Symmetry: D2
Subunit: 264 residues, 4 copies
């Protein structure tokens, strides 16, 4: 009776479904898949990428960047929501093939450096190739590329280094406040009395408040269904999208119900 | 007219003044210098070191460990207050010569990994040999060695990863609550509108509250004069030491006065 | 038509077959599986581990160490043949649970740090949790633990940082020269004109010569079948084992035949 | 009687003497100081920098890049001879301010990562801010930027990761083979029986042979005086420069004389 075989991170079919670039604002594009958000922001001095999806999406992301006229060497910076395998997967390969730099906070940087291994909740079950962050980001720090300013908003919970990004784009000249907020879920976590995360509940409750106050005219999430996006319908993709208030309220109601049956 | 010569980190004379081990409790010893705190905690399964002082103190710390019957291979773990040159200096050398592991939080880990360079306030002016943290610590996490439990209390401000450590020792059998709190000073910092640390003031104000509530019968600081310790007088070294309440109150009054004349 | 699912590193059944500690010399023990070598060397100042096998073998290795009276904190050092998943797999977990240090050369250190990803030949196909080396080793450097001296012999080829380890043990008082030589195979490699390894052939030919000259009375390999070991038969396990000369000769004949049909 | 003060790395006056860009070929420029070589290579897809000099030269290098029409974001790649403080000094700062990537071999990468500390010969005496290599380079590997191909030639000795770089430029249309060879000196090293570098002599002797065979019409060294360059005279700077044969021959004669009086 030997030891078990290693089992790989298998995801739903719609997470790996390629899609053509979908426009969000004058310079913001969804270039990921139907169920995974990968945002491209084109400026006069280069492109910015927010998240990348699964590790095997590196080639697809470069094809869609090429469809927008963005050569690999034009990618200047990669920003992250959190350093899990389904959102930072191809970061290591994208650095090698584009020469871009990665900016993240300290908690995301150390988790990224070990490829998601020794996760506080998942252990070594969901890993990916390691990557190193080039610039360390503080809460409220502004990152400017080509005139577009990105502001980091720490929201610890789903991971200690979970981060929301806000920036102002335009819609045919008129401004729009875009907010890319991270997950507020706890899929299978031990909430109360967790030895690896003693203040997990306090961090979550504060993040709910942080997301409510975010300056936002249009909300996007790493998983589009969390904010009621439907990338498949194209022009009507943002029709039923949620507000920052509604998104945070629904997350707290699910978090409270999960916390209630954990005591049971 | 050439470029200026590199200038080294020169400190006061009493920071580099060797002293013999001074006893604090049944298992807690000050083995640093007169003006730099380096705490040794002896257990049944090995020794724990909290801070190390200046980089050139590595040999002195091993001599004092030897005076307590602690061989180098008996040092199991190094804990840190914050990763500045005058307190984490010899950590890299101590790892090589003892085989100990280093535990710190993510912010201290990334600053330790780059030897204090690119400091948020000091730049590259005060550097030291880099060292890597082996175990990443969360706020409120308990670290146990030989039955003695160490609890981490995050107190960001002096550095983003500043940390206070609490543990219970004994004084001839009766328990005593020891608290090793980090610095609450801002020597030359830009407090308001700092681009590298946008929420510096909010972090400081919360840390003042954190230090007030710490479970503490006896307070020690990385610089002994900050808590009114005088290591030179030996038996009367703790006579005039401050409480956690008094230490936090004096720090906030100096921080408020500095913040008031910064607006001027 | 979506993107393919990630597939995990599946190995043969006998690679994951637990076995009880088998004695090799007075202080050298095989504590891995039937088809994966993990050598434990017990000294008066602690234990040394050479290789660890697959990532899921961490718990089994600690059980066998416990069977020899070796507590986890007694493991002082981990040495490696090469940093592939089937031999350095559990190194990251073993560091966390034992407080041991890892010593390897620069090439093995950088491959270990990225968990085997971006392999020169395998890419990201065979990964494992990353680990950092604590001490960097030069060719011919001696590592001493508890009086037993380990000498490193660089043999680049299978990986750039492939290393052979030699040390002298005893067999009921009389000395024996043990040599733990790495793999000399090229499973599916592109030998000629490889852009990632331009001098692959020159490195292999020199390693064949290095293994022939190794001081060796008894040869062991990471895969026991390569040196004609049969861990399953216990007392007769070393009966048919090869010499350093025979092992290197057979490797060069297979390497030359593979190089001949690559030109075809 | 306290512990000694830290002393900084003070160099000669001519090492920190700024100079205007001096042309070497159609695309190769010396933009360092009079006694420190920093080579800029301009291509159609960006610029390449070879070495940077002392840490305090970062601002000067960007001024000279600006004089050639090279914006910071146009710097694509930094190559290194060896990772000592007087040649890799400003690499960490240049990465932050340009978004360039660093390519080096494994030995240079690990020394660069610890800021030159724990040097095999100098210890912690000559340190600098740490930097991480983005791409790991093998011996004989070709690095292409904008059509210009750079070939790495390992020459261990001065440091284990010492590297020579060769590329073909033009002189008003006609080709010229440029070779940037590292130092072949051993300033104060222990050559025979060195525990940190057991095969130091063998590595040096092989490097002398490597430098003799380098394809070279024009030789440059990190210290210009080693190859008889005089950057101060401008147009006649290369008049008395040495060949690869003469440079290697003089290094071996000085190495043999030093090795002879070490036995004394
Ligand atoms: Zn996640
Ligand atoms: Zn400080
Ligand atoms: Zn292998
Ligand atoms: Zn040098």
């Amino acid at each position: 009776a030997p030891l078990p075989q290693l089992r790989a991170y298998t995801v739903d079919a719609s997470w790996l479904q390629p899609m053509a670039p979908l426009q969000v604002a004058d310079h913001t594009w969804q270039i990921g898949t139907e169920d995974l958000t990968a945002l491209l922001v084109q400026t006069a001095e280069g492109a910015v990428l927010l998240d990348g999806g699964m590790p095997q999406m590196a080639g697809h992301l470069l094809d869609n960047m090429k469809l927008r006229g963005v050569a690999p060497q034009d990618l200047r910076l990669i920003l992250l929501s959190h350093a899990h395998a389904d959102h930072a997967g191809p970061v290591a390969e994208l650095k090698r093939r584009t020469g871009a730099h990665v900016a993240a906070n300290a908690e995301t940087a150390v988790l990224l450096a070990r490829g998601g291994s020794n996760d506080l909740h998942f252990g070594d079950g969901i890993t990916y190739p390691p990557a190193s962050a080039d610039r360390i980001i503080m809460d409220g720090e502004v990152v400017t590329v080509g005139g577009i300013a990105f502001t980091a908003h720490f929201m610890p919970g789903h991971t200690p280094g979970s981060t929301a990004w806000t920036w102002t784009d335009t819609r045919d000249g008129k401004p729009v406040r875009i907010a890319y907020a991270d997950s507020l879920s706890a899929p299978g976590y031990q909430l109360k009395g967790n030895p690896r995360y003693p203040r997990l509940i306090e961090d979550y409750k504060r993040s709910f408040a942080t997301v409510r106050a975010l300056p936002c005219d249009l909300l996007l999430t790493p998983h589009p269904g969390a904010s009621n996006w439907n990338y498949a319908v194209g022009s009507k993709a943002s029709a039923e999208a949620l507000t920052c208030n509604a998104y945070a309220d629904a997350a707290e109601k699910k978090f409270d119900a999960q916390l209630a049956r954990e005591t049971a």
